[PDB]
Amino acid sequence: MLQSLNHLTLAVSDLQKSVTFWHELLGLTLHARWNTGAYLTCGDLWVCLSYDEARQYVPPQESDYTHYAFTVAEEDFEPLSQRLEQAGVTIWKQNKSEGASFYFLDPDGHKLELHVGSLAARLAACREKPYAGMVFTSD
Amino acid sequence: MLQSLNHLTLAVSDLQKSVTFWHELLGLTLHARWNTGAYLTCGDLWVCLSYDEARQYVPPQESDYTHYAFTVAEEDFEPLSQRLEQAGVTIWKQNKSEGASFYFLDPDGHKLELHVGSLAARLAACREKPYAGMVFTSDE
Numbered sequence: 001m002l003q004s005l006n007h008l009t010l011a012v013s014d015l016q017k018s019v020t021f022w023h024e025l026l027g028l029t030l031h032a033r034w035n036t037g038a039y040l041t042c043g044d045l046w047v048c049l050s051y052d053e054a055r056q057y058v059p060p061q062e063s064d065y066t067h068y069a070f071t072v073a074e075e076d077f078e079p080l081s082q083r084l085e086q087a088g089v090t091i092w093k094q095n096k097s098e099g100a101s102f103y104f105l106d107p108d109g110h111k112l113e114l115h116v117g118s119l120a121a122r123l124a125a126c127r128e129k130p131y132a133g134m135v136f137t138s139d
Numbered sequence: 140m141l142q143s144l145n146h147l148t149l150a151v152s153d154l155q156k157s158v159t160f161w162h163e164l165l166g167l168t169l170h171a172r173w174n175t176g177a178y179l180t181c182g183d184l185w186v187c188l189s190y191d192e193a194r195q196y197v198p199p200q201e202s203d204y205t206h207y208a209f210t211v212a213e214e215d216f217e218p219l220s221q222r223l224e225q226a227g228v229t230i231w232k233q234n235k236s237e238g239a240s241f242y243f244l245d246p247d248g249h250k251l252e253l254h255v256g257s258l259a260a261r262l263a264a265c266r267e268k269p270y271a272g273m274v275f276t277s278d279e
Contacts, residue, residue, distance in 0.1 A: 001166045004182030005144065006210040006254040011203035027140050032262060035272030039258060043143030044183075046258040052204040064150035065191040066249070070141035110205070115145045119178060119185040123171060131173035138170075 008045065008068065010110050011052035017107045018049045025087060026070075042070060058109035060092035067103070067111035074116050077102070081114065098125040146185035147207065149249050150194040156246045157188045164226055165209075181209060197248035199231035206242070206250035213239070213255050220253065238264065 012018040019038050023030045028040040028047060036051035072080055077100045084104055085091075092111055093103035099117030106112055126134060151157040158177050162169045167179040167186060175190040211219055220241045224230075231250055232242035239255040265273060 001215075002181050002209040002211060002253075004210045005147070005184045006208040006252070006256075007258070008144065008147075009204065009206045009208065011205045029276075031258065031276050032265065033272075033274045033276075034270040036270075039261070041258065042141050045144045050204050054203045064193045065148065065189050066150045067148050069145035069148070071143045071145040072141060076140065113145075114141070117145075119146070119170065119180065122178070122185075126171060131176070133174040134171060135173070136171050137168075 005045065007048055009048040009050050010106070010108075011055040012049050012108050013052070013055040013057070014107065015049060015051050021107050022047070022049060025084070055108055057107075060090070060105060060109065060111065063109060063111060065111075067113055069101075069113040069115045072100075072114045072116055074100070077114065077116050084114075098122050144184065146187055148187040148189050149245070149247075150191035151188050151247050152191070152194045152196065153246065154188065154190050160246050161186070161188060164223070164228075194247055196246075199229070199244060199248065199250065202248060202250065204250075206252055208240075208252035208254040211253050211255060216241070216253060216255050223253075 015036065015038065019030065019033065022028050022040055028042045030038065030040050032039045038049045040047045040049065081102045084102070089104040091103060092105055095101045095103070099115055099121060102114040104112050123136070127136070154175065154177065158169065158172065161167050161179055167181045169177065169179050171178045177188045179186045179188065216239045223241070223243055229244040230242055231244055234240040234242065238261070241253040243251055243253070245251055262275070266275065
């Protein structure tokens with residue numbers, strides 16, 4: 001089977017700007033860096049920033065709903081939202097779904113999200129107000 | 140402090156096709172499904188397939204290097220590769236490294252990867268044969 005996510009690779013246009021953002025702003029730990037990439041960790045997750053000649057800034061109106069969500073502790077959600085806003089981050093969605101969620105772009109427009117709450121919590125919420133046609137696989 | 144990846148959401152064009160691919164072919168466990176999405180897991184990873192009116196198939200040469208790598212056991216790599224090849228999966232890249240990596244597309248073109256090996260293993264391989272400009276953070 002697929003055991004887990006091995007690593008997330010994001011195409012970037014300016015490695016220096018991207019490392020600053022992911023390592024200093026978002027606080028990921030930096031393990032290695034070379035001319036055209038960087039390896040970082042977020043918890044267990046291996047995140048690779050990869051220089052790609054073809055990458056440009058992609059505004060949120062062009063890119064679709066594909067996005068990457070990172071877990072924050074409940075008491076950390078507010079101060080981290082605040083830190084991101086003050087850094088002038090672009091908000092791509094207002095929150096309306098289950099749990100504190102905060103939606104912001106990376107320096108190349110990768111759609112990011114801060115989120116408090118597991119899948120278990122989302123499933124719990126969906127048991128009470130199901131989405132249209134919802135079917136839970138545990139039958 | 141972001142604590143971990145919370146979930147990966149992929150925009151899809153055809154939820155039925157995508158669920159079949161992710162759940163049946165790739166074998167992720169399905170937890171829930173509704174009219175415009177599904178929730179699956181891959182180990183500790185929450186994966187959400189989300190129907191998006193704006194999503195079409197994106198040819199691998201039209202999208203950049205952004206990709207999602209998934210861990211497989213070493214004994215699982217070859218047989219999983221061939222099972223994917225036999226299913227008519229598209230290969231978007233030749234593995235030119237010395238590690239085990241298989242590059243393939245989901246039904247909408249999301250770039251995925253089977254990979255054997257940890258960050259620690261890549262690093263150790265990089266110490267032996269470093270990339271240009273390589274800096275290793277272990278050096279205070």
